[PDB]
């Protein structure tokens, strides 16, 4: 979870993603609120189909004391799945998202008991 | 005589300290003994009540 990796599927060709990567990364930064304490990093880009591309990201957050660390994957996924944020993501061409952290049974039970 | 008279004290103290454990064993026996002796009488009893149910 500490590695903070979120996989995003885009309904865009790989060449289009790479061709405008600066813009894509900044738009993701804007979705996060645009503060200078958050930085979006691209871990990888992979074609999945003619017009489907997976983009793996993480977000580095800086503390008031200058320390930096990655936003945990579960925390970042939780933000992106919020209805308002998901809609903004869909406007960028995102059609899905996944975190790598395998949740514990108690975490899963909590999510089922409180799906919202 | 100091090292000797001290050594004998430490040794005899340790032995006495061991005998305390020996005594500790001796103390915890009879109770546990009764508890143990209780078991076969019950299992030899419960085995009987089972036979009663089975015959029933």
């Amino acid at each position: 979870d500490e590695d903070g990796l979120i996989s995003l599927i885009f309904n865009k060709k790989e060449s289009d993603i790479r061709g405008q990567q600066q813009q894509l990364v900044e738009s993701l930064h804007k979705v996060l609120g645009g503060h200078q304490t958050l930085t979006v990093n691209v871990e990888g880009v992979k074609t999945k189909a003619d017009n489907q591309t997976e983009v793996i990201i993480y977000v580095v957050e800086r503390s008031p004391n200058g320390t930096s660390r990655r936003v945990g994957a579960s925390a970042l996924f939780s933000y992106f799945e919020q209805a308002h944020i998901k809609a903004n993501m869909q406007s960028l061409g995102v059609t899905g998202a996944m975190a790598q952290t395998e949740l514990s049974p108690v975490q899963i039970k909590q999510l089922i008991q409180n799906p919202l | 005589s100091e090292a000797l008279q001290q050594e004998i004290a430490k040794i005899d103290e340790e032995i006495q300290k061991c005998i305390r454990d020996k005594e500790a064993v001796d103390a915890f026996l009879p109770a546990h003994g009764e508890q143990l002796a209780a078991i076969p009488t019950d299992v030899n009893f419960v085995t009987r009540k089972s036979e009663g149910a089975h015959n029933a």
Binding site: - | I8, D12, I15, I19, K22, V25, D26, L29, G33, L36, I39, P40, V43, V46, T47, S50, A53, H54
Partner: protein
């Protein structure tokens, strides 16, 4: 000073001869425990059987 070594050795043999007995007693107790344990398991089986049979009779009635 020999009178101390005598006490030490006598106490030693005396308490050894007793420790052996204690240990033996414990061993015998263990034997008793497992010997009964087997029977306990037999009771578990017999009981489960009885239970199943009673359930069957319940079904029949």
């Amino acid at each position: 000073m020999d009178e101390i070594i005598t006490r030490w050795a006598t106490d030693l043999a005396k308490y050894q001869k007793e420790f052996k007995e204690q240990a033996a007693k414990v061993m015998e107790w263990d034997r008793l425990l497992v010997e009964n344990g087997e029977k306990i398991q037999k009771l578990y089986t017999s009981t489960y059987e009885a239970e199943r049979a009673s359930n069957e009779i319940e079904r029949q009635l």
